[PDB]
Amino acid sequence: NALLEAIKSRVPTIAIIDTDSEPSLVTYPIPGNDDSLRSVNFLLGVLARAGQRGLQNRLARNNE
Amino acid sequence: QHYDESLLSRYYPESLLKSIKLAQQTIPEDTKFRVSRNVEFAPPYLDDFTKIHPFWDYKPGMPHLHAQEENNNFSIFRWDQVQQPLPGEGNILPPGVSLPNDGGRKSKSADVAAGLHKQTGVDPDYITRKLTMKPLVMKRVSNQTGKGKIASFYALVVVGDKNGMVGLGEGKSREEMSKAIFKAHWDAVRNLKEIPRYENRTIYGDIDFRYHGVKLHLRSAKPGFGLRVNHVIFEICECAGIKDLSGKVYKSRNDMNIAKGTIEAFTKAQKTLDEVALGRGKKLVDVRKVYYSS
Amino acid sequence: LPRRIVPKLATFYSANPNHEDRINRLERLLRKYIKLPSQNNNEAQQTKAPWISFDEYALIGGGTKLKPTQYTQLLYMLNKLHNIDPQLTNDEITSELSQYYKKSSMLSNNIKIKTLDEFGRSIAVGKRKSSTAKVFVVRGTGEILVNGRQLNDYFLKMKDRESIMYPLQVIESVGKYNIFATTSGGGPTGQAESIMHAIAKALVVFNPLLKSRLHKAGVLTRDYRHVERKK
Amino acid sequence: QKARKAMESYNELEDSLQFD
RNA sequence: AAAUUAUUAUAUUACAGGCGUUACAUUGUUGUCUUUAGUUCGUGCUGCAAAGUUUUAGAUUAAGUUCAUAAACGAACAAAACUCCAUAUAUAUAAUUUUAAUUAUAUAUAAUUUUAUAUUAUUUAUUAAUAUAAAGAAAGGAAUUAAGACAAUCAUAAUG
Ligand SMILES: [K+]
Ligand SMILES: [K+]
Ligand SMILES: [Mg+2]
Ligand SMILES: [Mg+2]
Ligand SMILES: [Mg+2]
Ligand SMILES: [Mg+2]
Ligand SMILES: [Mg+2]
Description:
The structure is cut from a larger assembly and holds chains A, B, C and D. Chain C is α+β, with helices and mostly antiparallel strands.
């Protein structure tokens, strides 16, 4: 449901794509195990820190 | 607190000073007033009661249970207007409600533009100024129920800006056809798509597309050829900005399925010269265009 | 400098953003203070848990979206934070919990400790059916007077006499008090049991530790049954 | 006859309202 | 300035009157009667479409009872809540001979009770059924939507 709404709403999407998952339904697939909390939290953590660095770079350019 | 006559005479009218003096000689200064929790004699707000409010007090001269005038001394001789107009601004319009002074001035395009902007973020100005809407199918359908036959109005409309953007929308209403067209117009704007156009006038080459039972054969045409196609396709081409086109519909000629098939054909069955060139790693030259170039 | 409009709550896209935000705030406190021990008086069943009503929480927790199970989840976390040992609690926890306490605390109670009067008498009123009884209990030797008359004179039925004695028999103080009972209305049974109810309520002043035994015997409960017009 | 043909006149009438 | 107008009586004629008519046709009225968590509307989504909106032939209670859940979400609608009565308590009023102050009647509060523990089940968890302990005066009622199908002359109101 969410993926189809994102398509209808032209919202880019990222998702973990397991071997039984349809890759073309998302803009940026990440092939990987989606059943383990460790694998999911490892991939989520990397994406979250990447976002943090972007946020820190935006707040830094405002200061200087 | 007891106040000297001087102070009280600078705020209260002379007619009421005698009452204040007598009350300050009968109520001792050390009176410990108690609050009544059974009967509420005073109003819920502070009021000296020195001025007669035009609305919250009885109208002077009007007959009522507590009128103090004699029955032959009332001063209301005209009964064509409301005696006590509402206080303050003169209205009780709820916060967030607007007085319906003007009715029938709405434009359904502006109503569609406002709703879609709030729901999807599209620009209202583009919808109300750049888009043209043309109804394609308008019929009544019916469902057989235990209570009886329930009729519904079905509307299929096409919208476009005549500059590449075209959309198809459908709408249903059990009440009136105008409501069905409003929904179809609303749906059509949400389905707006860009269609490739060769020289912004025609399609790229020829198209043989099958949409359900409809066989569509569309051919590109020379400049100034005009639209020589099924009437349903004509309206879509007009909205989309296609000027030159030839074609023939075989097998099913259901208007609804011709319209949807045409929109699908313009998007899924066309390839721009640029897209073909990049995919094949080749240069594609329009000979007619080069012949008239420097 | 450039400004934009963004959702206020991190849980905006959830079903009930307001409830989830409040739950997250409480969950953070329960994580930050996971180590703090809980009350050992919880076994003593401390009688303190004045949390806002489901309807009152719906003003702040999503209104119609609020589900009963969501309210149950709020109470499980409010109680857990509340049951942290009072000595080891901190301001942060109390600040967060304050907003969820019933505002009835704004006012005060309507109960004043009952005490013996100038003559050492405990006065209580009781009601049964249409009957009423006002009894005067004082420390004595078991003398009873009903409307100035001997007990055997006023109440002819021994079962009515036994009903009057029951509260004193529960606290085993039948020979420790003098009772001056005044009764009016209804019949012998209503008056005798109205006196029974009034003696039980008057005996609690002499020793408030015996109220639980009186309640358990059933003598402190007002019998609600009355003649019902057939409907 | 009623159901099928009644709307021909009304749906064209809807188009009458459009110009109005 | 004797004519006019008021009242009253009498007379005059359209009529008045009718427990005459449901084999007098309709409307009320009330009755019974099912229905009372279901319709309509808005939006979203699926199907080319008429249409459908999906879990779900959910759990649970004596019972919409209560709670979950799904490409549906929400509003209106009405139950329910609410509200009143009863009961418990507080304040006020009575110069306690209109006395029943053990009362009268205004206002307010309270519960659709609450908590710990053991046992048995469970969707086993922040759970129900149980028992145990603790706190409590707390234990009972009332009214309530719109439709659908049907009855009564209503000597209980009408219109023709
Ligand atoms: K719908
Ligand atoms: K008295
Ligand atoms: Mg997997
Ligand atoms: Mg007649
Ligand atoms: Mg007769
Ligand atoms: Mg469709
Ligand atoms: Mg719904």
